[PDB]
Amino acid sequence: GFEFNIMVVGQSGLGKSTLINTLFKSRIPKTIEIKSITHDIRMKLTVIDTPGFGDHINNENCWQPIMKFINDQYEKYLQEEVNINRKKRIPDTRVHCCLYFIPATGHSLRPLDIEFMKRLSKVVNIVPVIAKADTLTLEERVHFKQRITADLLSNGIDVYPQKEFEDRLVNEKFREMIPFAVVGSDHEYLGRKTKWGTIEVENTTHCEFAYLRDLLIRTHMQNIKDITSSIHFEAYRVKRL
Ligand SMILES: Nc1nc2c(ncn2[C@@H]2O[C@H](COP(=O)(O)OP(=O)(O)O)[C@@H](O)[C@H]2O)c(=O)[nH]1
Ligand SMILES: [Mg+2]
């Protein structure tokens, strides 16, 4: 029953809730509350759905609920360690990874998304993602990725796998793909049936979800936990000085 917790984050209507169901299988109502969804694979996989952010005209301090949630899991874990009675196995409800959905605009990162990602990246591992990447043509995807990569660097946003931490060669493959071009679907024939052809979501030539999935739960899954435990949680623990 080894545990791994992922949280999806972004504005509403970006296919965030759809990708959650897509990930597990490997109309949905507008998400109004933070909801934790858990199924078993042996791994206990938890995907955390969240209300949209940046939906309002004014969005100051609108990152606080998600920020509260992330910090609440660190706090539960810390209090477990301080407990004198605890515990054969401390339950890990901490957010290990965080998929941040980026609107497939074509231009550049929005100050809104930059502001949010820059805050999240300090307390959790961020993996940027192009929402509804089927929107983009092949040439648009490449150009937009360049702008996102340039913007991430120029705004000092640490995405997983973080640079400061053979392994370097392996990690570049992950970094060259950020932001991941993902497509959501829960129908199978599994793809998204459009007017002109069906998009095969787990087909590497159609989108990049297949890569992200294997990179998140198979090859990097332990390292994401390790960074969560040794960097983010340890930094939280220190702050309680
Ligand atoms: N074009 C496209 N549409 C999608 C994709 N994933 C979901 N959608 C559609 O986007 C709409 C809202 O999706 P939803 O999962 O509720 O987004 P969320 O509210 O941000 O979680 C739905 O009508 C979906 O059918 C995708 O990969 N590509
Ligand atoms: Mg939703």
| Any ligand 1 atom below 6 A from CB of 22 | no
Element (H, E) at 237: helix 233-239
Beta strands in 13-63 (DSSP E): 35-40, 43-49
H helices of 10-63, in order, are 16-25
Q: Tell me how far apart the alpha carbons of residues 147 and 143 are, in angstroms, rounded to a whole number.
A: 7
For 115, the token pair is 């502001």
Residue identified by tokens 């089927």 is 134
Query: Which positions ≥6 away from 229 have C-beta within 8 Å?
Result: 94
Q: Which approach determined this entry?
A: X-ray
d(CA 118, CA 231): 16
Q: Are 160 and 96 in contact (CB under 8 A)?
A: no
CB 49 within 8 A of CB 17: yes
Pairwise CA distance, residues 159 & 9, whole Å: 14
List the domain range (segments joined by +) for residue 111: 1-241
Domain with residue 140: its CATH number is: 3.40.50.300
Indicate which ligand has the atom closest to the C-alpha of 102. 1
Distance CA 241, CA 220 (A): 32
Interval between CA 34 and ligand 1 midpoint (Å): 18
23-46 burial code (b ≥16 CB/10 A, e <16): beeeeeeebeeeeeeeeeeeeebb
The span from the CA of 4 to the CA of 224, in Å, is 9
The response to whether 16 counts as a known ligand-binding position is yes
Annotation-wise, does 78 bind a ligand?
no
Cα 162 off chain centre by: 14
Q: What are phi and psi of 57, to 5 degrees?
A: -70, -55
Q: State if residue 200 touches ligand 1 by the CB under 6 angstroms criterion.
A: no
Tokens of 225: 């936990």
Pairing of strands 2-9, 97-102: parallel
Sorted by sequence, the CB contacts under 8 Å of residue 215 that are 6+ apart come out as: 174
- 132 neighbors 140 (Cβ within 8 angstroms): no
Q: Report strand pairing: 43-49 vs 97-102.
A: unpaired
Ligand 1 pocket test target in 14, 18, 137, 207 with most atoms within 8 Å of CB: 18
Query: Which residue's alpha carbon is at the smallest distance from atom 4 of ligand 1?
Result: 15
Cα dihedral 148, 230, 214, 124 sign: negative
Count of domains for the chain: 1
Element (H, E) at 77: helix 64-82
Query: Ligand 1 in contact with 8 (CB < 6 A)?
Result: no
Resolution in angstroms for this experimental structure? 2.7
Stated length of the chain: 241
Q: Rounded to a whole number, what is the distance in angstroms from the first to the last CA of the chain?
A: 33
Query: Cα separation of 53 and 69, whole Å?
Result: 14
With a 6 Å cutoff on the Cβ, whether 94 touches ligand 1 is no
| Cα separations in angstroms, 199 against 21, 36, 122 | 16, 28, 35
Q: Is 192 annotated as a binding residue?
A: yes
Fill in the amino acid letter for 157: I
- The CA distance from 127 to 135, in Å, is 20
**If we measure between CA atoms, which residue out of 227, 193, 224, 201 comes closest to residue 24?**
201
